[PDB]
Amino acid sequence: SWFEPLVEDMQRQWAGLVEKVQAA
C-alpha cells in the first residue's frame, strides 16, 4: 500500500548492487 515512492529510491542504490552480483 504505502512506500510508493520509497521503492524508487531503493531502486537507485540497490539496482547498482544487482549488476555487481550478476557478474561476479
Curated annotation (Swiss-Prot):
Origin superkingdom: Eukaryota
Reported modifications of this chain: APOE exists as multiple glycosylated and sialylated glycoforms within cells and in plasma. The extent of glycosylation and sialylation are tissue and context specific. Plasma APOE undergoes desialylation and is less glycosylated and sialylated than the cellular form. Glycosylation is not required for proper expression and secretion. O-glycosylated with core 1 or possibly core 8 glycans. Glycated in plasma VLDL of normal subjects, and of hyperglycemic diabetic patients at a higher level (2-3 fold).
Specificity for association with VLDL: annotated segments: 1-10
Subcellular location: Secreted; Secreted, Extracellular space; Secreted, Extracellular space, Extracellular matrix; Extracellular vesicle
Organs and tissues of expression: Produced by several tissues and cell types and mainly found associated with lipid particles in the plasma, the interstitial fluid and lymph. Mainly synthesized by liver hepatocytes. Significant quantities are also produced in brain, mainly by astrocytes and glial cells in the cerebral cortex, but also by neurons in frontal cortex and hippocampus. It is also expressed by cells of the peripheral nervous system. Also expressed by adrenal gland, testis, ovary, skin, kidney, spleen and adipose tissue and macrophages in various tissues.
Function: APOE is an apolipoprotein, a protein associating with lipid particles, that mainly functions in lipoprotein-mediated lipid transport between organs via the plasma and interstitial fluids. APOE is a core component of plasma lipoproteins and is involved in their production, conversion and clearance. Apolipoproteins are amphipathic molecules that interact both with lipids of the lipoprotein particle core and the aqueous environment of the plasma. (Microbial infection) Through its interaction with HCV envelope glycoprotein E2, participates in the attachment of HCV to HSPGs and other receptors (LDLr, VLDLr, and SR-B1) on the cell surface and to the assembly, maturation and infectivity of HCV viral particles. This interaction is probably promoted via the up-regulation of cellular autophagy by the virus.
Quaternary structure and partners: Homotetramer. May interact with ABCA1; functionally associated with ABCA1 in the biogenesis of HDLs. May interact with APP/A4 amyloid-beta peptide; the interaction is extremely stable in vitro but its physiological significance is unclear. May interact with MAPT. May interact with MAP2. In the cerebrospinal fluid, interacts with secreted SORL1. Interacts with PMEL; this allows the loading of PMEL luminal fragment on ILVs to induce fibril nucleation.
Pathology linked to this chain's protein: Hyperlipoproteinemia 3: A disorder characterized by the accumulation of intermediate-density lipoprotein particles (IDL or broad-beta-lipoprotein) rich in cholesterol. Clinical features include xanthomas, yellowish lipid deposits in the palmar crease, or less specific on tendons and on elbows. The disorder rarely manifests before the third decade in men. In women, it is usually expressed only after the menopause.
Other observations noted: Binds to and activates LILRB4 on acute myeloid leukemia (AML) cells which leads to suppression of T cell proliferation and promotion of AML cell migration and infiltration.
Record-stated family: Belongs to the apolipoprotein A1/A4/E family.
Protein name, entry field: Apolipoprotein E
Organism: Homo sapiens (Human)
Taxonomy of the source species: Eukaryota, Metazoa, Chordata, Craniata, Vertebrata
From-to range in the entire protein, with total length: 281 to 304 of 317
